From a paper:
The ESX-5 type VII secretion system is a membrane-spanning protein complex key to the virulence of mycobacterial pathogens. Key to their pathogenicity is the secretion of a wide range of virulence proteins via type VII secretion systems (T7SSs). The ESX-5 T7SS is found almost exclusively in slow growing, pathogenic mycobacteria and plays a key role in nutrient uptake and immune modulation during an infection. The importance of ESX-5 and other ESX secretion systems (ESX-1 to ESX-4) for the virulence of mycobacterial pathogens makes these membrane-spanning machineries a key target for the development of novel therapeutics.
Here, we present the high-resolution structure of the 2.1-megadalton ESX-5 core complex. Our data revealed a highly dynamic central ESX-5 pore embedded within a rigid membrane scaffold formed by six protomeric units, with a diameter ranging from 4 to 10 Å, suggesting that we captured ESX-5 in the partially open, secretion-competent state. Moreover, our structure showed an unanticipated break in symmetry between the membrane and cytoplasmic regions, with a sixfold symmetric arrangement, and the periplasmic region, which displayed a twofold symmetry. Within the TM segment, one of the main interactions required for hexamerization occurs between the TM domains of EccB5 and EccC5. We observed that the EccC5 TMH1 of each protomer interacts with the EccB5 TMH of the neighboring protomer via hydrophobic interactions and is further stabilized by the EccC5 TMH2. This domain swapping interaction was repeated in an anticlockwise fashion when viewed from the periplasm, thus generating an interlocking mechanism of next neighbor protomers within the TM section of the overall ESX-5 complex. The TMHs of EccC5 from each of the six protomers, most notably the TMH2 of one EccC5 subunit that forms a domain swapping interaction with TMH1 of the neighboring subunit, contribute to the formation of this central pore. In contrast to most other TMHs of the complex, the density of TMH2 is less well defined, which implies that this helix is more flexible and adopts a range of orientations, as indicated by our calculated ensemble model. Our results showed that the narrowest constrictions of the central pore reduce the pore diameter to slightly below 1 nm. As this pore diameter is too narrow to secrete folded substrates with an estimated width of around 2.2 nm, we hypothesize that our model, in the absence of a bound substrate, represents a gated, secretion-competent state.
Numbering used by the authors:
A (entry chain K): 145 to 308, 318 to 417
B (entry chain N): 18 to 323, 339 to 494
C (entry chain L): 288 to 502
D (entry chain J): 12 to 74
E (entry chain K): 13 to 48
F (entry chain M): 95 to 120, 140 to 167, 194 to 259, 288 to 332
């Protein structure tokens, strides 16, 4: 089942650019048609009325399904919370993309001040730069500063339009905390590239629909409610979104040692 | 560094390996899987696979998985252990929710507990008619004890023959299920009214002739049901042990005019000798080629499975199961005999009373030897239970008829302190660890309890 | 205890802390889209496993139900013991006024042994059936021990050996056979018919009628 | 709706209904409720008690 | 791959019940007289 | 009795009151075979080192294993014989590799070994560890020298005895 998702805008595109980030509620595929001919509130029988209230309340959602983020609708996301929560979620995201999408469809970049936390990513072929070769194979697309962008190939695009497909969809991850992003990153972003701001800063947090905030120690993400189908924001108030599928460094490394075995 | 040699097992194969004992399991599981797959493919065995979604894991043979972040060491894997390799199926799914309280109650109960069923109902009926017929037989025995009427013996005989024919018809017709224990319960239930029917035919006042006749015929029937059925043989082993001792006492009271104390001390001697002989006797009785009916453990192995090949496995297992059941029945019967003889000896209003209390203590230690020595949980627990019951029986035999606060306070104090010491020996003592030398010294002490019984047996005999 | 056997489900609801919904009497607002969020169970090892999500506060219903069951089983056991003890109060032989407590015992036997149909958990049902037969056993043993009549002895051993045997035959026959809806209906009604006399007969045992007849 | 606030008789029967339905869900593990023997036998109890009361009154009239 | 389908289900209409009007005062007087 | 198993070697077995099997091995070898009395699942009754010679220097392991102490292991396996055959192949493969080689005996060669052990008397020794290489020295036409290992507790305890002619 690995790397089986497809570029083309039909079919798999419903799940090509989307990533499981956690678990949480969603609206069912059954749609509750209105209980027409409701009696007036003095005539309303207590038991059946209350039972129907409870049915509408609780059958409103399916509990503990995978919660998804679409990479195609926000120019970036910014991750606010405790460091290991944020990192664990980031490793989970990276491994989800690495399993689901091949290296020819999604390429990955990590920009960091602490490369020891990111030493596991070297095994993942998606971090391999096809352009530079070394003894170990393809060059790892991990940089220690935003100034260390010697690519300039992901930075000649225009501003980004949210999808409603680029050849690789670059995912650039930053926990460098550098003011220099706002030069190469406008208010709208870059075309084929989505970003993930670790260590949430006022530069990246300028859009609450992009901020995934760990509100509870277990990794409860709050963000804005989005439509199950279009991934578009439905209303502006921040609310419970998911509990994050946080993953340890050892599991990530183990998966990376698995993924390194393959070259197709 | 330390590396543990262990066995590992998967895919109906066991392999032995040496694992880097202090590296996390998450470091080693993946190439261990590759190793196992290579070895199985070399054997022509279908290799392991991931089915759907889930993850590979290692377990102890008891079933508990190992923490992947932990090494072998700190989760107490040692050299010579066995590990079981699995792909654990994905546990997560949507949580259901039933918003209405009444429906949620009904569905949770129905899902999680077991209803009454006719399979259970027939067993319940058999149990209750067994209890009823033992009450009726014991009641007729009470009446013949109280009154000299010959007429109870026809009633006991007729109820015995009816229930025995019913049991035989059920065992013959309905042998096809493991619910033939209904017939076994009825047969166990119906041998008793036969015993009291034969016993009540002895004329004159009730006593030793009635006792020896009833126990002899009941033990004889319990011996026959071994060769004709061979099912549920622990209880019949205990019963034939009790009937052997009771018949030996009845013949000693008819052929001779021996006192009760002499016979009880003989019975105690026979008990401690038989305790010494019981495992060997069990290993003998293990091979009497009685019918082959698999008990529960053997049945539930033979469902998972099809002097060479599997027929040897089947025979070895059945033979061991018979052995363990015979041994357990024997120990229960001896336990009953031991407590009943010690209770019969320790009359408080006797001049020799200090001596049988010593016999009690010596037997108590001797039993605790076997309790620490014998492997089966329910045999060690049998031995411990009877050992305690010695003390309880002699204590009450004093304090009930000896109307003094002194003996009362002594009994009740030892009756609460002594089992608390028995608990203390495992509760506070770290995992019941003592040195092998100290263990062997305790074994010496409780062995040195035995040879004082021999002259005391002579002295209480005369 | 006869009353309490009918209260035992309601009391076992009430003690388990199940509470039935409040009612919106006067508030006149029926739509609430509050969508209660997941309680989240942290993995007991704390060992970096992701936490798991349970559906709502309503997840405690799964605990409360199992508690209610345990209460109900306790109630039926206790009431069993009490009714057997109370029906041990039949000491004298049946000549005189003493067939009335024997008749009362027979009625409460029939009532319990039919009552067992209503309880589906095997240990509640078995608890009622064992209670029912234990009534008959205790009454019979007290007649044969207190009275020295051999006829009483013969009747006691006869009922002890036949009645549970009849129960065994009923257990073997009944779940396999079909039955007529009429027979099923009278096997309902025999419950109520054997239940109803027990209070009048009880007042006969207290001689409430005679005291009120003359006080 | 906390406290000792007033309640209508239609709520009294509505609660008693939910109590019976929960009792049936507790003793049996079905909630199909088209017939219910619980009511029938508590009516039999009521018949027993009312018969004892009636006979007690019939005893009072003697002097 | 698995299957999923949308559905639309109208919820049933709750019961209706006329609120009791309450007995007039003279009825209570009559009741007390009858018992008297 | 005999078997060839899903393993690697043919293995002879004898039974009378429990199972017996023997392995030949070809200066001193390691003494640490006491651990193989307690394999990963099976529990063997004893490990006996056996040796015989003058010339005709022969050296043997004979193993005793009670199935009834091992039922929990046998029940997992398709035969009791296959169980002990595997456990002896384990010991053979553990000994094999050095200058000394090892294999299970065929039961025919087991009767040959019994004949050569008979070929047609001093005290059992309390302290033995140094004795072995000099206890061969007394003049005889035939010597049989053997050492026994038994599971007295979680350790393993040792006894040795000899006879001449």
């Amino acid at each position: 089942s690995s790397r089986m998702w497809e570029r083309q805008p039909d079919g798999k595109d419903l799940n090509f650019g989307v990533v499981r980030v956690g678990v949480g509620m969603t609206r069912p595929e059954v749609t509750w048609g209105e209980p027409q001919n409701m009696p007036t509130d003095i005539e309303l029988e207590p038991v059946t009325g209350k039972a129907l209230q409870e049915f509408g309340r609780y059958q409103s959602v399916v509990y503990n399904l995978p919660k998804m983020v679409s990479l195609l609708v926000e120019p970036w996301y910014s991750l606010v919370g405790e460091r290991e929560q944020v990192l664990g979620l980031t490793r989970a995201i990276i491994c989800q993309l690495a399993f689901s999408h091949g290296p020819d469809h999604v390429q990955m970049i990590v920009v960091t001040s602490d490369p020891d936390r990111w030493d596991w990513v070297k095994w993942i072929p998606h971090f391999g730069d096809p352009r530079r070769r070394d003894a170990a194979g393809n060059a790892r697309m991990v940089y220690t500063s935003v100034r260390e962008f010697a690519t300039e190939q992901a930075e000649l695009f225009a501003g980004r339009g949210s999808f409603t497909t680029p050849t690789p969809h670059h995912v650039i991850i930053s926990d460098i905390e550098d003011p220099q992003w706002e030069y190469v990153i406008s208010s709208e972003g870059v075309d084929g590239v989505t970003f993930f701001d670790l260590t949430g800063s006022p530069l990246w947090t300028g859009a609450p629909q992009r901020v995934l905030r760990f509100t509870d120690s277990a990794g409860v993400i709050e963000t804005l409610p989005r439509d199950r189908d279009t991934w578009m924001v439905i209303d502006d108030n921040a609310w419970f979104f998911a509990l994050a599928d946080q993953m340890s460094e050892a599991d990530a490394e183990q998966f990376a040692h698995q993924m390194a075995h393959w070259r197709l | 560094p330390q590396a543990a040699v262990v066995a590992i097992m998967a895919a109906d194969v066991q392999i032995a390996v040496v694992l880097d004992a202090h590296a996390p399991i998450s470091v080693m599981i993946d190439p261990l899987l590759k190793v196992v797959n290579t070895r199985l493919r070399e054997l022509g065995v279908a290799p392991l696979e991931a089915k759907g979604r889930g993850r590979w894991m290692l377990c102890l043979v008891d079933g508990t998985p190992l923490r992947p972040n932990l090494s072998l060491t700190e989760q107490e894997v040692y050299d010579g252990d066995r590990l079981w390799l699995k792909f654990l199926e994905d546990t997560e799914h949507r949580s259901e929710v039933i918003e209405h309280i009444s429906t949620a109650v009904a569905t949770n109960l129905s899902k999680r507990f077991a209803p009454i069923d006719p399979v259970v109902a027939v067993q319940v009926g058999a149990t209750m008619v067994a209890v009823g017929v033992l009450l009726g037989s014991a009641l007729l025995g009470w009446w013949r004890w109280q009154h000299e009427s010959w007429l109870p013996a026809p009633f006991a005989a007729v109820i015995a023959v009816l229930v025995l024919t019913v049991a035989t018809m059920i065992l013959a017709r309905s042998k096809t299920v493991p619910d033939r224990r209904v017939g076994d319960i009825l047969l166990l239930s119906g041998l008793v009214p036969l015993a009291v029917a034969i016993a009540a035919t002895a004329p004159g006042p009730v006593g030793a002739p009635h006792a020896v006749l009833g126990f002899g015929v009941f033990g004889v029937a319990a011996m026959l049901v071994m060769r004709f059925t061979g099912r549920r043989l622990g209880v019949y082993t205990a019963l034939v042990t009790l009937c052997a001792a009771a018949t030996a006492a009845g013949l000693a009271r008819m052929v001779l005019l021996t006192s009760a104390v002499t016979l009880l001390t003989c019975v105690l001697l026979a008990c401690v000798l038989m305790y010494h002989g019981a495992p060997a006797l069990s290993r003998w009785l293990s091979g009497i080629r009685l019918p082959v009916f698999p008990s529960a453990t053997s049945r539930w192995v033979f469902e998972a499975r099809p002097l060479e090949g599997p027929a040897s496995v089947r025979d070895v297992l059945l033979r061991a199961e018979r052995a363990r059941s015979f041994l357990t029945g024997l120990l229960v019967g001896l336990g009953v005999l031991t407590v009943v003889c010690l209770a019969g000896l320790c009359d408080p209003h006797a001049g020799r009373r200090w001596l049988p209390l010593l016999l009690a203590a010596f037997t108590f230690g001797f039993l605790i030897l076997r309790g620490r020595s014998y492997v089966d949980r329910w045999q060690a627990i049998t031995l411990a239970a009877t050992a305690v019951l010695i003390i309880a029986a002699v204590a009450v035999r004093y304090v009930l008829v000896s109307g003094s606060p002194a003996v009362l306070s002594a009994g009740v104090a030892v009756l609460v302190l002594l089992p608390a010491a028995g608990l203390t020996a495992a509760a506070v003592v770290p995992n019941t660890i003592y040195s092998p030398l100290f263990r062997k010294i305790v074994e010496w002490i409780e062995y040195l309890c035995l040879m004082p019984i021999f002259p005391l047996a002579l002295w209480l005999m005369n | 205890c006869v009353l309490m056997y009918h209260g035992a489900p309601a009391l076992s609801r009430w003690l388990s802390g199940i509470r039935l919904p409040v009612f919106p009497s006067a508030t006149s607002r029926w739509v609430f889209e509050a969508r209660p969020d997941l309680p989240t169970t942290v993995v007991v090892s704390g060992g970096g496993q992701p936490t798991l999500e349970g559906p709502a506060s309503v997840r405690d219903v799964l605990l409360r139900a199992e508690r209610a069951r345990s209460f109900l089983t306790g109630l039926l056991v206790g009431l069993g013991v009490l009714t057997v003890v109370c029906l041990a109060g039949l000491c004298d032989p049946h000549a005189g006024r003493r067939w009335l407590p024997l008749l009362l015992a027979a009625f409460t036997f029939g009532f319990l042994i039919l009552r067992g149909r209503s309880y589906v958990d095997r240990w509640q049902a078995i608890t009622l059936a064992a209670t029912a037969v234990l009534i008959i056993a205790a009454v019979a043993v007290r007649y044969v021990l207190v009275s020295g009549s051999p006829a009483v002895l013969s009747a006691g051993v006869a009922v002890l050996v036949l009645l549970p045997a009849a129960g065994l035959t009923a257990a073997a026959v009944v779940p396999n056979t079909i039955y007529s809806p009429l027979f099923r209906k009278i096997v309902e009604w025999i419950e109520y018919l054997c239940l109803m006399p027990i209070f009048p007969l009880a007042l006969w045992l207290m001689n409430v009628y005679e005291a009120i007849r003359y006080r | 709706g906390y406290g000792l606030g007033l309640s209508t008789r239609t709520q009294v029967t509505g609660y008693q209904f939910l109590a019976r339905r929960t009792a049936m869900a507790l003793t049996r593990w079905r909630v199909r409720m088209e017939v219910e023997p619980g009511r029938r036998q508590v009516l039999a109890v009521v018949a027993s008690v009312s018969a004892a009361g009636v006979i007690c009154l019939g005893a009072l009239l003697w002097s | 791959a698995p299957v999923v389908k949308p559905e639309n289900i109208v919820l049933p209409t709750p019961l209706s019940v006329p609120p009791p009007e309450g007995k007039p005062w003279w009825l209570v007087v009559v009741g007390v007289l009858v018992v008297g | 009795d005999h078997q060839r198993r899903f393993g690697h070697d043919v293995v002879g077995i004898r039974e009378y009151q429990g199972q017996l099997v023997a392995v030949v091995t070809v200066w001193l070898p390691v003494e640490a075979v006491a651990a193989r009395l307690r394999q990963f699942d099976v529990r063997l009754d004893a490990i006996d080192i056996v040796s015989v010679g003058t010339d005709e220097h022969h050296t043997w392991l004979v193993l005793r294993m009670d199935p009834q102490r091992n039922v929990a292991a046998v029940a997992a396996r398709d035969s009791v014989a296959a169980t002990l055959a595997a456990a002896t192949e384990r010991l053979a493969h553990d000994l094999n590799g050095r200058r000394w080689t090892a294999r299970p005996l065929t039961s025919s060669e087991i009767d040959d070994m019994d004949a050569t052990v008979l070929a047609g008397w001093v005290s059992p020794r309390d302290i033995t560890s140094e004795t072995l290489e000099r206890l061969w020295l007394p003049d005889t036409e035939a010597t049989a020298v053997t050492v026994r290992l038994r599971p007295r507790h979680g350790g393993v305890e040792v006894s040795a005895w000899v006879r001449y002619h």
